[PDB]
């Protein structure tokens, strides 16, 4: 079962937010969204660029093996 870190990211709108998925690997929510495999191959960055307030919410990575849920919060500048 993949690990999805951290349990909570809080950013300001317009900032970047980068979760780590550790383990076909997908990023779900219960362009601007990118997945990057790191050199080591076990760990992937699941990044949001130019975060918007509507990005706020609950996310998982799945390999169907699902990680624990994590939360994104995008505050108002």
């Amino acid at each position: 079962p993949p690990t999805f870190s951290p349990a909570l990211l809080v950013v300001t709108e317009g900032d970047n937010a980068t979760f780590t998925c550790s383990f076909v690997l997908n990023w779900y929510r219960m362009s601007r969204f990118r997945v990057t495999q790191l050199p080591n191959g076990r760990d992937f960055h699941m990044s949001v660029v130019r975060a918007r307030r509507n990005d706020s919410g609950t996310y998982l990575c799945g390999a169907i093996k699902e990680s624990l849920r994590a939360e994104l919060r995008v505050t108002e500048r």
Partner: antibody
Amino acid sequence: QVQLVQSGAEVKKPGASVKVSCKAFGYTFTTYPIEWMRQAPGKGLEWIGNFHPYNDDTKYNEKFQGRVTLTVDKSSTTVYMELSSLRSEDTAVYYCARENYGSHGGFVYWGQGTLVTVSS
Amino acid sequence: ENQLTQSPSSLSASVGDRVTITCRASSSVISSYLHWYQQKPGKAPKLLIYSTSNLASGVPSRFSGSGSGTDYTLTISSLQPEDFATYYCQQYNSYPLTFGGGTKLEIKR
């Protein structure tokens, strides 16, 4: 068994620095930001900043004007709040706190508070 | 900063009464990010209500929260002895985080 345990009461002269510890127990240290607040007798509650062990990111209240530094020791799951150039108006109980799943900004877990008295 | 102002600053009531406290934000907050704490003398605050209306763990259902935009309330609909304390609101809508000044619930006599 989530717990935040802070260091003990401190007395300081004006101009000095304090470093207050908050040691996190009972969960994966990197999963949550640690938030800092203080409560002065007649001011109520003031937010100081936060530090995320996940990525070492810090946010600060601009009111502190770069007088606060937050640092971490991952080895001992401890976040440090260092407050420099202390003034009388810095006398307060300092708290660390964290959220929990789904609290959306609400602080579920709190350290016991550290009294810092600043005075000549 | 988004200033929060609580009303009233103090109020006196009895065991069994119902009271409502108000939190007003200088700027509109998404209601997910507005919370309430109870503080008793010599203790850290304890989260009471998160996201406007959700009771925190172990909080009795005589507490309720309501609101949105800039206007929020906390109600205790049948006071118990333990309930006399200071209540604060807090916003996690924008940095810096802010808290209200507090409302102190006292015993009427």
